Amino acid sequence: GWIRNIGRYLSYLVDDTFEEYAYDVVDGIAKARTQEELLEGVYKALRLAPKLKKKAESKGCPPPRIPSPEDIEALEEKVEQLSNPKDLRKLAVSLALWAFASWNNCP
Amino acid sequence: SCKAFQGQTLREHIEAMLAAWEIVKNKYIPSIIRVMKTVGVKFTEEDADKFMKTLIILHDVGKCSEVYQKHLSNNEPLRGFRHELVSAYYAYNILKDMFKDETIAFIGALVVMMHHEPILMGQIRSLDKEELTPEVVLDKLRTFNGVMEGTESFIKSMIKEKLGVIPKVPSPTQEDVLREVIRLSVLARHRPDSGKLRMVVGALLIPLVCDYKGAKEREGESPKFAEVLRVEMMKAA
Amino acid sequence: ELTGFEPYDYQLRAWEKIREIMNNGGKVIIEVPTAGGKTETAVMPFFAGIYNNNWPVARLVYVLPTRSLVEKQAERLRNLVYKLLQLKGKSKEEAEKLARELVVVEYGLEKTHAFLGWVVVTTWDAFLYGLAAHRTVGNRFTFPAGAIAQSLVIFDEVQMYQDESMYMPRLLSLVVGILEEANVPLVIMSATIPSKLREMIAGDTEVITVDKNDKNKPSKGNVKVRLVEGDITDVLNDIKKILKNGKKVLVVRNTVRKAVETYQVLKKKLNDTLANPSDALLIHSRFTIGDRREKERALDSARLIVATQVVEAGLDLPNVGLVVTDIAPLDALIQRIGRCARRPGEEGEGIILIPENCIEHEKIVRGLSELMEKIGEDTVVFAVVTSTNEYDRVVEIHYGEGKKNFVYVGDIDTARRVLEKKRSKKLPKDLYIIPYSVSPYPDPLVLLTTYDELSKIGEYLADTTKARKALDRVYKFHYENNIVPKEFASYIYFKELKLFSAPPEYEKRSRPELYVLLYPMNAEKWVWKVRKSFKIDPYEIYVIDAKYYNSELGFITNLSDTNSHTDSDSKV
Amino acid sequence: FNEFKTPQIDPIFDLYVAYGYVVSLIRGGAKEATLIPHGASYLIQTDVSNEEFRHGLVDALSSMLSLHIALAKLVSDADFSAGANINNVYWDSVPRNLEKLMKDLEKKRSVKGTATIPITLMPSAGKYMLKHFGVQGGNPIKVDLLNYALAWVGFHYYTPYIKYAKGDTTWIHIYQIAPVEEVDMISILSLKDLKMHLPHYYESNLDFLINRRLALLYHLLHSEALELFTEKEFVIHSYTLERSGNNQAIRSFEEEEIGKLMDFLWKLKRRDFYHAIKFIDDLLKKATEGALALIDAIMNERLEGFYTALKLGKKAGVVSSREIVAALEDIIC
DNA sequence: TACAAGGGA
DNA sequence: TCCC
Ligand code: NI
Ligand code: NI
């Protein structure tokens, strides 16, 4: 549920085809204790969209797909109720592990 | 009332198998007999004809599993359904009932198991991307629900037409066929027999080459396969 | 009928031994010296089995141990089946059409069918591959060893020493043992074998050997053997004196490198007779552009026949004159020189040409195979040859069973119900590698253009290739040493190159430069002091004749190779 | 029912003898048999008499000696000859004991002596023993010849073991699989399928056979006998043997289980194998630290272990396909 | 991973 | 003491 798309977008920052290697954002978002730092980390991760799209357009492969706003609000509306950090940890690590999948983008 | 193949019904295919086996009988039966003395139990060529006829009738009963056949009718994928397992359950139980012997039904269950293609377990080097793997076999095994309701009826019908002695049908739920197939496969994999099993059961596999005759095929080497379809002519001309 | 003999050979000495096979039997042993020429071992029982249908046995299998004239055996079986087709019909035209089709070489390709054919010729190299392989077409699996069980499998001198890769008597003992409980008749043909093997592979089978009564066996005649110096110039005087007479010279090399140069250095210094219709016709050794029959059926001529360790078995040359050969491990030599078939005599001559020991580095591995090779002066053309090999290979090697890369364990646990060889666990079975002969000068543009995977796009079945003619296009390459690749590597259905990190055996391979029609290429005090020497290898690649202490072989070619780093101290 | 009693010596050696009982039984027949564990006794119930038991045992040891003679005072590179015998003198001692047991056995004669048990079949034994204020000369611990030989057969036919050379020294990891509740014939033959002969791995690139847990993970990667213990409880007892400067000793005796590791592997490999076996092999060979993190995560169910393993794999050479990520997420639940 | 320290016939 |  709305995890595959954000997983692909995050993997766009790790694939060798994108010679930028933004590991700080994924490392920070993986190690999150509560709401504020994870929100800041995901914001920093999604802030790098223009450079990814420009690099993809200049390389010739199809541009990356930014997560749709329809499921953008899903992250928020599910995350406020996660007062306990424990059940937050499973999703915080699920996004990180989905960020490291193959996700063949530019053939 | 059921259909085995996508292009052919149950009868128009199984009758072709049985009819071809009548010609190939005098060619391949004595090899089966010389193999089956080694097992420790032996009967005449006529009882061998009965055993082969039972294998011919019972290797496609599992095809009519009311879910796999639905996938066959359409183009839906089957993702590794081994109906030969349920067919081996049927063959084992029914041959318990008729032939009153324990090892020959085990051999026949294995013969049904290889039908189309045998299972592959252990000793692999990651060259089994397809369904040749016990995990997907167990997947299909637990996802197995049940056979057609008329399966017992037409099984009795073909039992009457081929032998006519007594009609009897085994009923697999899900766990019972699990126990039967796991027991038979594990025992065949490991016994004091080392090379005896492969020779014997491959020998019983060899006559089961009429599937190319049953359905139309476009293989280039099939004509070469037709070289050994008929034996040397007994009559000079 | 069984009494009627279709060939013009009348009745042989082993006519009464035919009934020992029957339909329910075990191991039956047949022995006769120089069986390569006049074999007639087990084809008559099968032929008499099929005269009025009522087949006792499904098929027949003839086994060539390592590398020999498979095409010659195929032609012989084709001629025999055509002859038995006589007196029954089939006119003249369509008999040969089916005779050519029922014979299958089965090199290993054409996965559509595993093993089919009324009579086929196989090789132990391919026989091992046949016991475990997957041939699935149309969701139908043809089990390659299924036909082996009920067919008559017959060996032919399968105790022949090779390039440290086939001479394993323990493997043969294991094979005969595992075949014993299958309740199938197994008969083996051999010229010379030790007495020690004849008891651990046949514990209750009597040897028929040669019987003084009913003297009808094909005698060899008079053969004289002498030790001569190995030089190219020395043998010349023995050539011009046989070619004019009408005889021929048969040169045998123990190394492919020596064979790929002997013909070239001998075809230019003679300049006496024709070359196109007579020369350029030799035995196949991973060359001739895949196929072998193109220069195999034309060998029936009294001309120069350059050869190597491939002509050792499977030859019925009627005119045998002088045979020169390199160092041989006695058992190889006696089989090679026993080529004088037909009528006894014919002034059969066989000699050995070795400079000192240089030919022992590829077919002897030093050891007793080369140390006792020079102690071979008797003709050994009788049935008492068994009293000769005991002190040549049994007293020094077979007692210590010193062998390298022996994979016996891969045939017991692996071969229980079913497995496959191309995907082993830890011990790959070194049998053969099939290369592809190309010569694209401007064509290479990555992916080798053609010969694609042909996936779901284009082909619905996604399993189709243009290798229909490739069945007679691959070589016979054995994995011995590669060091670095020289040809275009392959992974699946050619192309994709890559695989620069120790490419494995089997399949793949595509030879570009090595593709041509002509050829394809890239004890003094020790004996009198003690006995019971060691085996295996050490820092020096040769054996050790350990009399009391140390005493390695600072001799042969290993010392010359090792002298590149230490040439002092009299080469140790 | 025979209900043959099994001597109480060591729940490791007792396991070996009472668990080679079944392999001696199967070759002679003895259907409808079961093995009831008693913590350490491991009693067996069977409908067999003694003669068929003896025929099965002699058949097993005849195959054993046939395998022994295939390589060569004869020393063979076998599990019971040199693969597991850490001591050089045992390389010759064990085959002689086996052939003496045979020679006594085919002539319907019971044994009359006792023999010293190596540390291989029981790590609890050794050379000395503290009596009150010191040790005894020689080896105080000794066992009956028939029990010794049959435990050797059981060890050779069932229990996997892995050797790695690394020059002069040598690591030998020995594992024994133990039930605690109930087993039948089919289960025991499934366990038998796990045993693989001649695991002389040596080599230099395969250097991760140290860290015994990693070695057993690698061995279980290529083992596909059955997923039997997902319905039956089983444990694993492991130990290591070392040749550090010709100084042989046991330096590891941790006792965790085996069920959940292969359960996670089996739930991990539904999607495909072409990207599963190579995935594990690449993570083991390249990211040894990542493989250690992954195995710790499997052992103790911690979320960060999977992430660390995936990051270490991706950093060097691992593709980390999508389906394996989905399988890992499904394992997380 | 460098050093030592050991188990037996 | 021999035996790595
Ligand atoms: Ni079917
Ligand atoms: Ni079919």
Task: Name the residue among D79, A85, D57 with its Cα closest to residue C413.
Answer: D79
The 10 Å CB-count burial string (b at 16+, else e) for B202-212 is: bbbbbbbbbbb
C41, C246 in Cβ contact below 8 A?
no
| Partner residue facing B126 (CB), from D192, D193, D274 | D274
- Annotated binding-site residue? B139: no
C147 CA → ligand 2 middle, Å:
18
Whole-Å CA distances, C25 to B213, C51, C184, C539: 35, 22, 6, 49
The phi and psi torsions of D234 (rounded to 5 degrees) equal -145, 155
Reported resolution, Å: 3.3
Task: Name the residue among D287, D177, D289 with its Cα closest to residue D223.
Answer: D177
Å separating the CA of residue D168 from the C1' of nucleotide E3 = 15
What is D66-95 written as a DSSP string? HHHHT-------SIIIIIS--SHHHHHHHH
What is B134-148 written as a DSSP string? HHHHHHHHHH-----
Burial class of residue C239, CB neighbours in 10 A (0-12, 13-18, 19+): buried
E strand residue ranges, C338-418: 348-354
Calculate the CA dihedral of residues B83, B85, B86, B91 and round it to 10 degrees.
Answer: 120
Q: Please name the nucleotide lying closest to D243, CA to C1'.
A: E6
Identify the residue whose tokens are 């990211």.
D287
Count CA atoms within 13 Å of residue D209 on its CB side.
Answer: 24
Identify the residue whose tokens are 């004239």.
C69
Both structure tokens of D299: 């052992």
Q: Are strands C136-137 and C140-141 parallel, antiparallel or unpaired?
A: antiparallel
Instruction: Mention every residue, 6+ apart, whose C-beta is less than 8 A from residue C210.
Output: C13, C31, C32, C33, C217, C383
Alpha helices in chain A (DSSP H): 4-11, 23-30, 35-47, 49-59, 69-79, 85-98
C448 to chain B, minimum CA–CA distance in Å? 25
DSSP tag of C157: S
Q: Are strands C119-123 and C60-64 parallel, antiparallel or unpaired?
A: parallel
Instruction: Mention every residue, 6+ apart, whose C-beta is less than 8 A from residue C139.
Output: B116, B117
Rounded Cα–Cα distance for residues D183 and D44 (Å): 10
Q: How many helices (H) and strands (E) does chain C have?
A: 15, 12
User: Given phi > 0 = left and psi -120 to 50 = alpha, else beta, which region is D202?
Assistant: left
Identify the residue whose tokens are 């292969």.
D262
Burial class of residue D159, CB neighbours in 10 A (0-12, 13-18, 19+): buried
Using DSSP's 3-state secondary structure scheme, residue D174 falls into strand
D223, B125 in Cβ contact below 8 A?
no
Identify the residue whose tokens are 């290369």.
C435
A42 CA → ligand 2 middle, Å:
56
Count CA atoms within 13 Å of residue D1 on its CB side.
Answer: 12
Rounded Cα–Cα distance for residues D181 and D229 (Å): 12
Using DSSP's 3-state secondary structure scheme, residue D163 falls into strand
Rounded Cα–Cα distance for residues C145 and C129 (Å): 9
Both structure tokens of B163: 């032998």
Å separating the CA of residue D291 from the C1' of nucleotide E2 = 25
Instruction: Please report the sign of the dihedral spanned by the C-alpha atoms of residue C438, residue C444, residue C447, residue C452.
Output: negative
Task: Name the residue among D182, D200, D191 with its Cα closest to residue C409.
Answer: D200
* Residue B60: count of CB within 10 angstroms of its CB: 22
Rounded Cα–Cα distance for residues D293 and D304 (Å): 9
Q: Is the Cβ of C408 closer than 8 Å to some Cβ of chain D?
A: yes
Q: Is the Cβ of D74 closer than 8 Å to some Cβ of chain C?
A: no
Identify the residue whose tokens are 């030879």.
C511
C12, C37 in Cβ contact below 8 A?
no
Q: Is the Cβ of C426 closer than 8 Å to some Cβ of chain D?
A: yes
Task: Name the residue among C374, C379, C372 with its Cα closest to residue C398.
Answer: C372
**How many residues are given for chain B?**
237
D139, D93 in Cβ contact below 8 A?
no
Element holding B98 (H helix, E strand): helix B84-99
Name the maximum alpha-carbon separation found in chain C.
78
Q: How far is CA C177 from the centre of its chain?
A: 22
Rounded Cα–Cα distance for residues C261 and B157 (Å): 75
Inter-chain touch A96–D307, beta carbons under 8 Å:
yes
Q: Is the Cβ of C91 closer than 8 Å to some Cβ of chain B?
A: no
B63 CA → ligand 1 middle, Å:
5
Residues 82-141 of D with CB under 7 A from strand F: 88-89
Rounded Cα–Cα distance for residues C485 and C513 (Å): 12
Q: Are strands D234-243 and D248-249 parallel, antiparallel or unpaired?
A: antiparallel
Task: Name the residue among C264, C283, C284, C393 with its Cα closest to residue C333.
Answer: C393
The phi and psi torsions of D58 (rounded to 5 degrees) equal -70, -35
D90, D248 in Cβ contact below 8 A?
no
Q: Which residues pair with C226 in a beta bridge?
A: C351
Interface test with B, best of C24, C175, C414, C418 (most B CBs within 10 A): C418
Calculate the CA dihedral of residues C447, C452, C457, C462 and round it to 10 degrees.
Answer: -150
Both structure tokens of D80: 């019971």
Whole-Å CA distances, D80 to D10, D60, D67, D72, D155: 20, 13, 10, 13, 8
Sheet holding C223-229, edge to edge: C223-229, C348-354, C322-325, C249-252, C305-306
Q: Please name the nucleotide lying closest to D142, CA to C1'.
A: E8
Task: Name the residue among C557, B128, C242, C405 with its Cα closest to residue D278.
Answer: B128
Both structure tokens of B150: 């008329």
Count CA atoms within 13 Å of residue D134 on its CB side.
Answer: 3
Task: Name the residue among C65, C164, C159, C66 with its Cα closest to residue C370.
Answer: C164
Rounded Cα–Cα distance for residues D68 and D76 (Å): 6
Rounded Cα–Cα distance for residues D302 and D293 (Å): 10
Rounded Cα–Cα distance for residues B234 and B83 (Å): 39
Which amino acid is located at C503 in the chain? P
* Residue B235: count of CB within 10 angstroms of its CB: 8
Q: Which residues pair with C559 in a beta bridge?
A: none
Q: Do chains A and C touch (3 or more CB pairs under 8 A)?
A: no
Instruction: Mention every residue, 6+ apart, whose C-beta is less than 8 A from residue B206.
Output: B28, B31, C143, C146, C147, C150
Rounded Cα–Cα distance for residues C119 and C314 (Å): 16
Q: Helix D50-69 and helix D13-26: axis angle, to 10°?
A: 100
Instruction: Mention every residue, 6+ apart, whose C-beta is less than 8 A from residue D329.
Output: A3, A94, A97, A98
Q: How far is CA C356 from the centre of its chain?
A: 26
The 10 Å CB-count burial string (b at 16+, else e) for C190-228 is: bbbbbeebbeebbeeeeebeeeeeeeeebebeebebeee
Kindly report the bases of strand E lying within 7 A of a protein C-beta atom. Answer: 1-9
Rounded Cα–Cα distance for residues C327 and D244 (Å): 47
Task: Name the residue among D40, D29, D33 with its Cα closest to residue D4.
Answer: D33
∠ CA C104-C110-C116, nearest 5°, is 40
Rounded Cα–Cα distance for residues D233 and D183 (Å): 10
Q: Is the Cβ of A66 closer than 8 Å to some Cβ of chain D?
A: no
C10, C4 in Cβ contact below 8 A?
no
Which amino acid is located at C189 in the chain? M
Rounded Cα–Cα distance for residues C184 and B34 (Å): 9
D215, D196 in Cβ contact below 8 A?
no
Instruction: Mention every residue, 6+ apart, whose C-beta is less than 8 A from residue B142.
Output: B174, B178
Which amino acid is located at C262 in the chain? T
Rounded Cα–Cα distance for residues B71 and A26 (Å): 44
Inter-chain touch C137–B219, beta carbons under 8 Å:
yes
Rounded Cα–Cα distance for residues D317 and D224 (Å): 26
Task: Name the residue among B15, B39, B11, B22 with its Cα closest to residue B204.
Answer: B39
Which amino acid is located at C83 in the chain? K
Identify the residue whose tokens are 């592809």.
C436
C188, C159 in Cβ contact below 8 A?
no
Task: Name the residue among B113, B92, B190 with its Cα closest to residue D186.
Answer: B190
Count CA atoms within 13 Å of residue D137 on its CB side.
Answer: 0
The 10 Å CB-count burial string (b at 16+, else e) for C32-71 is: bbbbbbebebbbbbbbbbbeeeebbbbbbbbbbbbbbbbb
Element holding B34 (H helix, E strand): helix B10-39
Both structure tokens of A11: 């993997």
Burial class of residue C510, CB neighbours in 10 A (0-12, 13-18, 19+): buried
* Residue D252: count of CB within 10 angstroms of its CB: 15
Q: Helix A85-98 and helix A35-47: axis angle, to 10°?
A: 20
User: Given phi > 0 = left and psi -120 to 50 = alpha, else beta, which region is C560?
Assistant: alpha
Rounded Cα–Cα distance for residues C77 and C149 (Å): 21
Binning chain B into helix, strand and coil, the percentages to the nearest 5 are 55, 0, 45
Instruction: Please report the sign of the dihedral spanned by the C-alpha atoms of residue D249, residue D254, residue D257, residue D261.
Output: negative
Both structure tokens of D296: 């710790």
Q: Is the Cβ of C200 closer than 8 Å to some Cβ of chain D?
A: no
Both structure tokens of C493: 């259905």
Instruction: Mention every residue, 6+ apart, whose C-beta is less than 8 A from residue D189.
Output: B186, B187, B189, B190, D26
Which amino acid is located at B228 in the chain? V
Instruction: Mention every residue, 6+ apart, whose C-beta is less than 8 A from residue C349.
Output: C223, C224, C321, C322, C323
B100, B166 in Cβ contact below 8 A?
no
First-last CA distance in chain A: 26
Using a CB cutoff of 5 Å, list residues around ligand 1, an ion: B 63
Rounded Cα–Cα distance for residues C134 and C130 (Å): 9
Count CA atoms within 13 Å of residue B85 on its CB side.
Answer: 28
Using DSSP's 3-state secondary structure scheme, residue C528 falls into helix
| Partner residue facing A97 (CB), from D310, D319, D321 | D310
Burial class of residue C547, CB neighbours in 10 A (0-12, 13-18, 19+): middle
Rounded Cα–Cα distance for residues C417 and C398 (Å): 32
Rounded Cα–Cα distance for residues B2 and B11 (Å): 9
Task: Name the residue among C562, C561, C544 with its Cα closest to residue C553.
Answer: C544
Rounded Cα–Cα distance for residues D68 and D79 (Å): 9
Closest amino acid to nucleotide E9 (CA–C1'): D89
The contacts found for D68-75 with CB under 8 angstroms, 24 or more apart, are D68/D95, D68/D98, D70/C170, D70/C408, D70/C409, D71/C401, D72/C400, D72/C401
The phi and psi torsions of C61 (rounded to 5 degrees) equal -130, 130
Q: List the determination method.
A: cryo-EM
